[PDB]
Design a protein around this ligand. Structure first.
Ligand SMILES: *[C@@H]1O[C@H](CO)[C@@H](O[C@@H]2O[C@H](CO)[C@@H](O)[C@H](O)[C@H]2NC(C)=O)[C@H](O)[C@H]1NC(C)=O
Ligand SMILES: *[C@@H]1O[C@H](CO)[C@@H](O)[C@H](O)[C@H]1NC(C)=O
Ligand SMILES: *[C@@H]1O[C@H](CO)[C@@H](O)[C@H](O)[C@H]1NC(C)=O
Ligand SMILES: *[C@@H]1O[C@H](CO)[C@@H](O)[C@H](O)[C@H]1NC(C)=O
Ligand SMILES: *[C@@H]1O[C@H](CO)[C@@H](O)[C@H](O)[C@H]1NC(C)=O
Lengths: 959, 311, 49
């Protein structure tokens, strides 16, 4: 029986004969799906190998051992490959090809053969691969062997098997079946330029996330990938279907008609008419319709409608034809040559037969001159000798014709050209008004003359059907982008798809206030947020779940009316702030960028005005302001400081930051890992301050801020003890120097553990350089579009300006030059403007970083939550590509404790207040402690002052 | 008043320019990654908006809460602090703000909805009131309000005895001033100038955006079918290219000024976070930064896409 | 700035080309100078920020 199995990762071929190295190139072509239900075939007693159609195109593989498959038959010219005992021959009998006896080379299974059959645009590509191998572990790139311009289509292929005859037994055989449909793979090339993986953008949500990120390792986070829209389903065509009604009673069921010369002309206008009446009645047999096609009457409508009623005889109907003349034709009525009219004929014997005899018809016979078209004569009369002995074909026949005319007046007569849908995201078309949305009830009452209402946003919001008098509300149908909830591949592999404000009734499964969510099960509990999902939804892995973002550490403060709690401990938590102080300054030659060495390009471009010059001026301003930012950020001091050759800093270890004399490039480990982690027509100008000089300024700034304190920003550096300096910094954050004095070595120990955690976090944190890498990505992608918009082949025969010149006359070749250069110049100008705004943002950030350097490093900042979280102490710089990294010291308190405090001790009528401390008790003794730390001190007459009496202090006590 | 958020949006470039027209989409997709630049710049705007919102409101990961027993010793903050009896947990001042203030594109919801922003503001108030400024630097170290204001007067150069003799009178002055704030916000159309105008700027920015689609540029019909039916296909293609490139330039220009306000209000919101640090999360020595004059105290309040303070 | 116009100023286009095509070429200069104006305004906004 046929068997089904997973195709896994087979079918990866190079698209053409173009080699690419170390690129993640993604291209669109006919490709075979991944993880497909590939049928397994076996031949054993039974023989089930029916005809295998070609369809669009077939990827076929043969797991061949001992060369049992020898050839096939291709035909509907037909393609065949034959291998006799000598060599291998390829035959198409238009197309011929000779290659190698590969299939004869043939150099339990020891080998596996691989084949490719591709047939588009008359080019037939085969890739050959001998793979010496329940699937054995291995892989092979599909080498491009041959391309043959067959120019033929073969709509079927067959399978041939080899038996053994002297009994006879048919061996077990298998083959693989798949087909190519246009999709877009994503590749990877290793150091040796070989494919190791291919992922389409259209198999999996994981696959398309990979396609978007262009990186096969994913850290974590919510990524936007695509959009969701509800596609329309039906075509709605609406017109005056019912409404009024056209006059047909006196046209068809009128009792009496008129004579030809006095033919009745009447106006039919502004009425609803249906064409199905004549079509659905049998007697109206003859419908040969002149000048205008009756099928397209649903599209074309004339100015007005005329219905002429008249009576003619039988034998002279044949005489009415073009190219002939006669008495009746030249003196009664001459038909138009361009007659755009439509005729109806039927039997009317009951309406034409009279027993008493019809002798009341008159007509005008004598005329002085020939009648002209669209003319009437009223300026001699014969009676028609009609007799009942007339033949079957000579009896009078009634014909009624509708006549239409074309004039300058607008078409005032047009009929309906239908059904009304309800409550579906489909098209609504009311007299030419198109749209897309849902149709719901409308609570708003219009006025009878008003049809189309609008909202504030100047959009169609309400509509009423021209035939059915109901007001409807057109709410926009569900709209939302496709964003993927997928954590790092190091943790999971499942995907989750989110829909921004869209109900899944248009697509376990969970419905949120952002719509419906597919791929996670909602959790009613509260957990700390990790990745924001939307509208207060966050995910935490403990599979993929989504829950309303818990606020965080939900807590109720223990407000006290008479008691205080002050921390007795803390931590020096040190973090990283990364501020990009510069960017990749660029200066672009306009003429080079557009055409370079093209004389005509250069001459015809430089006369287009000062565009290139002004853009270059803007870029030069950009470059000089990066140089200025570097000046303001780094070179705020002109006296080059160097630490003494002894790298001793009072027990504080700084081995990972100082410049190292061992390395000739003066490169610290932190900037080492930063360098490792960071990643024609392009111009990069070297920094005015190279990495070496930037590092030297960092060294000098450190020398100042450690050895000589914060004075070096005010001129010459003033030598000052480092721990008295840090005591001053504690004083600046409201902490007494005794805290540092009695915590000297231990605070050193926490400082060392903190810097070690810093270096570990920098080493193991791929997101620490996120902003810098982000700036680099802007630079890169801007350059990519900037360059690629010119030399893109786009799969045409030739994309050469000289090719256009050779294929066109010079007058229009110059026009093509103009169009091309204008397009490229506009693209460049857009790039430059984007660069300008990015530069302004970087300029703001750079002023920010200069302020950080000045107020966090060259001195202490009391401005909380600018130089790091909490009361900020001091900071350290370090170099970074086009940027800088600042390490901050912050006093973060911990280990809070309630304490028994007194407002005033009323002794001898005096209420006692301190300048800075708070009086507290441990239970048996009363001590004074400061604001941001619990530090008891002796309460004497010296260290306290009496201000006010006891009748104003809240909390009178006796002690 | 400081604008904080904007009506963040992401524009499907193809849907914007063309709609569901397969011909227009096929034409447009060959014009390069300008659309990708547009979308990704807008995504940068959105993530910037969310991170400004987080810096402004989720400055503390730990969420302190106001007890129903609001025993402040006679300092009633009912109009700023949402009442537990009030169903949707929003301040009356927020209600005044909200009822005072007033396709093919999207509006993304804030990560912190109106309720969650209000809750963040409530946590900030609880910290800065019951526990004072230290909750920015760590745990909300509880500290009684009269002595917290005594610390503030020691900040501006006043002894705590002066407060204790003046506690009742400054309380009455403060509550009367709060009443004046209530009346001024209720009756003052110019009280919300900055937020109302930034909401405007977003609004008529989007409005000129949508009317740009109504800029005909001299053709017969913006739907491609009429152009093809009444014109030769070769010239129809070129006119299609002209119209779509005009609209593409318009969208690029719109997002250009959108980035311009992105930077502007980003700096403003940085200032807002800085002044919650210096004004809510502590005392500022800065002049003309927590309002006019020496600073004493501040109370943040939620607002549509922005914040409002009573310094 | 020529902007692909055989004459760079409006009155000279009027004098040098018949009105039916002079109007369209004037339109082309109008949109080019418009581009220039938006560029200048964007520089103005950035500088003023
Ligand atoms: C304050 O906290 C620090 C750590 O946060 C404490 O330091 C630790 O003290 C214990 C007690 O002997 C030692 O075993 C640890 O080795 C210390 N840590 C380190 C990194 O060395 C300190 O003792 C605390 N002080 C008070 C008064 O509570
Ligand atoms: C400080 O720690 C570093 C870490 O490697 C060590 O090399 C150094 O000897 C220690 N002591 C001093 C005084 O730097
Ligand atoms: C102080 O005591 C109260 C009593 O309920 C308790 O809730 C609070 O956590 C205590 N605070 C400290 C810092 O010990
Ligand atoms: C409180 O501290 C004092 C001195 O620091 C000490 O003498 C006393 O014993 C302490 N109280 C208790 C209950 O131990
Ligand atoms: C404070 O204001 C509220 C609301 O305006 C009012 O109900 C209350 O009586 C006022 N006074 C106190 C002490 O709460």
């Amino acid at each position: 029986p046929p068997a089904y199995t997973n195709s896994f990762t087979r079918g990866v071929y190079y698209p053409d004969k173009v080699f690419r190295s170390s690129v993640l190139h993604s291209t669109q072509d006919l490709f075979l799906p991944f993880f497909s239900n590939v049928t397994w075939f076996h031949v054993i007693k039974r023989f089930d190998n029916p005809v295998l159609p070609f369809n669009d195109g077939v990827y076929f593989a043969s797991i061949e051992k001992s060369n049992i498959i020898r050839g096939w038959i291709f035909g509907t010219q037909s393609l065949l490959i034959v291998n006799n005992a000598t060599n291998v021959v390829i035959k198409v009998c238009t197309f011929e090809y000779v290659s190698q006896p590969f299939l004869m080379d043939l150099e339990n299974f020891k080998n596996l053969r691989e084949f490719v059959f591709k047939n588009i645009d008359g080019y037939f590509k085969i890739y050959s691969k001998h793979t010496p191998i329940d699937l054995p572990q291995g892989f092979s790139a599909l080498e491009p062997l041959v391309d043959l311009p067959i120019g033929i289509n073969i709509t079927r292929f067959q399978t041939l098997l080899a038996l053994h005859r002297s009994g006879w037994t048919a061996g077990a055989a298998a083959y693989y079946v798949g087909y190519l449909q246009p999709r877009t793979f994503l590749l990877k090339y290793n150091e040796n330029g070989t494919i190791t993986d291919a992922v389409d953008c259209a198999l999996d949500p994981l696959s398309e996330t990979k396609c978007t990120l262009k990186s096969f390792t994913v850290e974590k986070g919510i990524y936007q990938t695509s959009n969701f829209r509800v596609q329309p389903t039906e075509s709605i065509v609406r017109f005056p279907n019912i409404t009024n009604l056209c006059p047909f009673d006196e046209v068809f069921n009128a009792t009496r008609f008129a004579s030809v010369y006095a033919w009745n002309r009447k106006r039919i206008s502004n009425c609803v008419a249906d064409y199905s009446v004549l079509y659905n009645l049998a007697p109206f047999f003859t419908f040969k319709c002149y000048g205008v096609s009756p099928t397209k009457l649903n599209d074309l409508c004339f100015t007005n409608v005329y219905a002429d009623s008249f009576v003619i005889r039988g034998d002279e109907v044949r005489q009415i034809a073009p190219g002939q003349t006669g008495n009746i034709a030249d003196y009664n009525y001459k038909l138009p040559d361009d007659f755009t009219g439509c005729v109806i004929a039927w039997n009317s014997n009951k309406l034409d037969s009279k027993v008493s005899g019809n002798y009341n018809y008159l007509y005008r016979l004598f005329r002085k001159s020939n009648l002209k078209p669209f003319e009437r004569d009223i300026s001699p009369l014969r009676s028609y000798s009609f007799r009942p002995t007339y033949g079957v074909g000579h009896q009078p026949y009634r014909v009624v014709v509708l006549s239409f005319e074309l004039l300058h007046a607008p078409a005032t007569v047009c009929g309906p050209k239908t059904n009304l849908v309800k409550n579906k995201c489909v098209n609504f078309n009311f007299n030419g008004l198109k749209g897309t949305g849902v149709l719901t009830e409308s609570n708003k009452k219009f006025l009878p003359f008003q049809q189309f209402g609008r909202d504030i946003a100047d959009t169609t919001d309400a509509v009423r059907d021209p035939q059915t008098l109901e007001i409807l509300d057109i709410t926009p149908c569900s709209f939302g982008g496709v964003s993927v909830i997928t954590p790092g591949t190091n943790t999971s592999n499942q995907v989750a798809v989110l829909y921004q404000g869209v109900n899944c009734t248009e697509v376990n499964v969970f419905q949120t206030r952002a719509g419906c969510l597919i791929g996670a099960e909602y959790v009613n509990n509260s957990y700390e947020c990790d990745i924001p999902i939307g509208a207060g939804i966050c995910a935490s892995y403990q599979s993929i779940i989504a829950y309303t973002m818990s606020l965080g550490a939900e807590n109720s403060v223990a407000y006290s009316n008479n008691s205080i709690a002050i921390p007795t401990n803390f931590t020096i938590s040190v973090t990283t702030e990364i501020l990009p102080v510069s960017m990749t300054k660029t200066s672009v030659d306009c003429t080079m960028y557009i055409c370079g060495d093209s004389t005509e390009c250069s001459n015809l471009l430089l006369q287009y005005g000062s565009f290139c010059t002004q853009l270059k001026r803007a870029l030069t301003g950009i470059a000089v302001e990066q140089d200025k930012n570097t000046q303001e950020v780094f070179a705020q001091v002109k006296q080059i400081y160097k630490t003494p050759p002894i790298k001793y800093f009072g027990g504080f270890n700084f081995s990972q930051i100082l410049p190292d004399p061992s390395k000739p490039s003066k490169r610290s480990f932190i900037e080492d890992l930063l360098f490792n982690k960071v990643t024609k027509g392009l111009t990069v100008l070297p920094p005015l301050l190279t990495d070496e000089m930037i590092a030297q300024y960092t060294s000098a700034l450190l020398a100042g801020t450690i050895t000589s304190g914060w004075t070096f920003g005010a001129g010459a550096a003033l030598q000052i003890p480092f721990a008295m300096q840090m005591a001053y910094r504690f004083n600046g954050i409201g902490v007494t120097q005794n805290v540092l004095y009695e915590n000297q070595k231990l605070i050193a120990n926490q400082f060392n553990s903190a810097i070690g955690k810093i270096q570990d976090s920098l080493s193991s944190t791929a997101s620490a350089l996120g902003k810098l890498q982000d700036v680099v990505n802007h630079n890169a992608q801007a350059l990519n579009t900037l360059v690629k918009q010119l030399s893109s082949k786009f799969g045409a025969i030739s994309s050469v300006l000289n090719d256009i010149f050779s294929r066109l006359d010079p007058p229009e070749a110059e026009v093509q030059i103009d169009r091309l250069i204008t397009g490229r110049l506009q693209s460049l100008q857009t790039y430059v403007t984007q660069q300008l705004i990015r530069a302004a943002e970087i300029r703001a950030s750079a002023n920010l970083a200069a302020t950080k350097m000045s107020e966090c490093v060259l001195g202490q900042s009391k401005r909380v939550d600018f130089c790091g979280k909490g009361y900020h102490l001091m900071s350290f710089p370090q170099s970074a590509p086009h940027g800088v990294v600042f390490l901050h010291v912050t006093y973060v308190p911990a280990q809070e404790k309630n304490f028994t405090t007194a407002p005033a001790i009323c002794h001898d009528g005096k209420a006692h207040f301190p300048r800075e401390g708070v009086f507290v008790s441990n239970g048996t003794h009363w001590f004074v402690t400061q604001r941001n730390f619990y530090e008891p001190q002796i309460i004497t007459t010296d260290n306290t002052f009496v201000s006010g009496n006891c009748d104003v202090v809240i909390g009178i006590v006796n002690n």
